[PDB]
Design a protein around this nucleic acid. Structure first.
Lengths: 66, 127, 184, 35
RNA sequence: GGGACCGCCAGUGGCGAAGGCGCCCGGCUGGAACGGGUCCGACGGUGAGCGCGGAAGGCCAGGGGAGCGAACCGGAUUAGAUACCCGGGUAGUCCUGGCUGUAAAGGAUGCGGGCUAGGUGUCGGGCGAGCUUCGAGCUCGCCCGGUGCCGUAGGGAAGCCGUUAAGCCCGCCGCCUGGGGAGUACGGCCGCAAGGCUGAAACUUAAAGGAAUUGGCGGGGGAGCACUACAAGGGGUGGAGCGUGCGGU
């Protein structure tokens, strides 16, 4: 289990097909990219301060459009 | 002394090819395409393959003594499309994050001043 | 494995650029290093960041053991820079000329001019005429190498802008690309 | 070939190009029969 | 090495009678504006009959053939696919010399003169100021000519036009007389050929046709919604038997 915990700092807004998925912003608290800000996707309800687990830091979500 | 390579990236809407060469570009050092790594024809141009195969080429390039590289991105161009495929920036992140130093990033898509007639007939590709 | 059979040769610049170290290249045989082209920016030569757009193409012609020496086959500005300069509601003037140096080197030189606003065509022709005259004169006055150096410097371009302001103020006169056709 | 533009509004009829081609074919055959 | 084409600058720009015309330079040549009565003196408008050139495509003779791609050959899709999609592929696309005289060749607006509220930009020429690092540079007004938008009166079935009229007058030809039969039959002329120019009759029909309003609908667009919608989670039917009822005997 070489997972990378990271902390939710901001919610961009709902995205994805059903809108259930939420576009979030997360700060990498540990690993090789400590302190980096990443736009990422979340399934399930989210709050300001959730410790999202990452399989990779390489993936960054595409910018959502309106 | 530090060695510099050139990463020719060719990202269409159907595939992405990463080809790492010397500074003179006359020597093929690493050459990995999207088809090498995924067995489904429809997933070749995705940024996922552009990530994975690009890293597969990058590690081998690091093994052979090259640490720094410039990037040259080429959409099909000519009479073909001009927009780089989706995976170009993904592969760029691949080389940046796989330890390679990134120098100058320039586009080399061949643009015609006045070239041949494109494909599909007069009324376009009536999909 | 064939990679273990390779060896790395160093390369330098031409003398008039100082012959600075530029890079290294692997090759099986020294003869395979002949007729190899390397593109290097001017910041990588002089360290000046204002001229990163400029690019120089060197053609390799001498292999002395591991040392490799090269000549100046061409130069070209950055396509991104060229695209940036061009904009709508402006007139792009392209002047293409074939020129012999004072020492007999043969060249094809293409120079660009951009003015503030849309302009009448005859004025553009006059601009072309002015810079034709000036570069012909400098071709007959200067020798090949110093001509290359000044063209890279942009002194010729600035003087050209000064002379063409007598017809219309130029946003920017510049040299885009130069290709060496033949040698004496 | 006098061309009435009113015959091009496609309601209740074929595209005028194709009727024109049909009638031309008919003309070719009829002339050939007479020679 | 080969053929084709001259991107960005590009726009309601510009020029041309129209089709149409875009890399750079040298030469020949047409045309207009603008400024000047600088000359002549109604020499003008229109034009039946005539003449001229005139996008693409096709055709005749010889070349040419990069890409593209009629026909055709395969792959795929489909109930069926003579197609759409993909892989090929001849003619053609290009050059020379001719023909064919064509299109939603449309501003669907034949051309010339006089008059009829305006504002506003751009294009070119002239004029007057001001700025000017002194440019064929830069800002504001006017006249001329070209070209767009808005818009008064006026016009019109309305759509809309409105000094670039589709308003009111003055000049000259063509064209139209319910829909279809028909752009046919027959005849004539033209063209190598495809085919071009000209063109009825019987007979049939209660309408065809134009603008615009309301609705309905769109495998159009935008916004707001959900348990007769879904995402999360749970429960559960159609497998067996039986209760109840529907269709059938």
């Amino acid at each position: 289990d070489e997972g990378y915990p990271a902390e939710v700092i901001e919610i961009i807004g709902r995205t994805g097909t059903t809108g259930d998925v939420t576009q979030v912003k997360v700060r990498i608290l540990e690993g090789r990219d400590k302190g980096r800000v990443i736009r990422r996707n979340v399934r399930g309800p989210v709050r300001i301060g959730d410790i999202l687990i990452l399989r990779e830091t390489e993936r960054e979500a595409r910018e959502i459009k309106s | 002394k530090e060695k510099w390579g050139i990463a020719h990236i060719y990202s269409s809407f159907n595939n992405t090819i990463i080809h790492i060469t010397d500074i003179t570009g006359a020597e093929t050092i690493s050459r990995w395409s999207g088809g090498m790594v995924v067995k489904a024809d429809r997933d070749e141009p995705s940024p996922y393959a552009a990530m994975l195969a690009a890293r597969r080429a990058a590690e081998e390039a690091l093994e052979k003594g090259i640490v720094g590289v410039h990037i040259r991105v080429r959409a099909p161009g000519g009479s073909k499309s001009k927009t780089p495929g989706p995976g170009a920036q993904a592969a760029i992140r691949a080389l940046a994050r796989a330890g390679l130093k990134i120098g100058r990033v320039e586009d080399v898509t061949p643009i015609p001043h006045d070239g041949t007639r494109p494909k599909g007939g007069r009324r376009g590709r009536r999909v | 494995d064939k990679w273990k059979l390779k060896q790395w040769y160093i390369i330098y610049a031409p003398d008039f650029f100082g012959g600075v170290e530029v890079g290294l290249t692997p090759a099986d045989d020294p003869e395979k290093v002949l007729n190899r082209v390397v593109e290097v920016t001017l910041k990588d030569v002089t360290g000046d960041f204002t001229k990163s757009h400029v690019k120089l193409y060197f053609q390799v012609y001498d292999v002395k053991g591991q040392n490799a020496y090269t000549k100046f086959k061409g130069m070209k500005l950055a396509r991104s820079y060229i695209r940036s300069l061009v904009r709508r509601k402006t007139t792009r003037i392209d002047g293409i000329f074939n020129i012999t140096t004072k020492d007999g080197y043969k060249l094809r030189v293409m120079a660009m001019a951009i003015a503030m606003r849309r302009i009448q065509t005859s004025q553009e022709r006059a601009i072309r005429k002015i810079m034709q005259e000036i570069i012909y004169k400098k071709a007959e006055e200067l020798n090949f190498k110093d001509f290359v150096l000044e063209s890279v410097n942009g002194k010729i371009a600035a003087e050209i802008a000064k002379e063409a302001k007598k017809i219309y103020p130029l946003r920017k006169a510049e040299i885009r690309k130069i290709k060496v056709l033949e040698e004496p | 070939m006098k061309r009435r533009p009113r015959k091009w509004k496609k309601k209740g009829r074929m595209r005028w190009k194709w009727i024109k081609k049909r009638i031309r074919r008919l003309k070719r055959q009829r002339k050939k029969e007479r020679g």
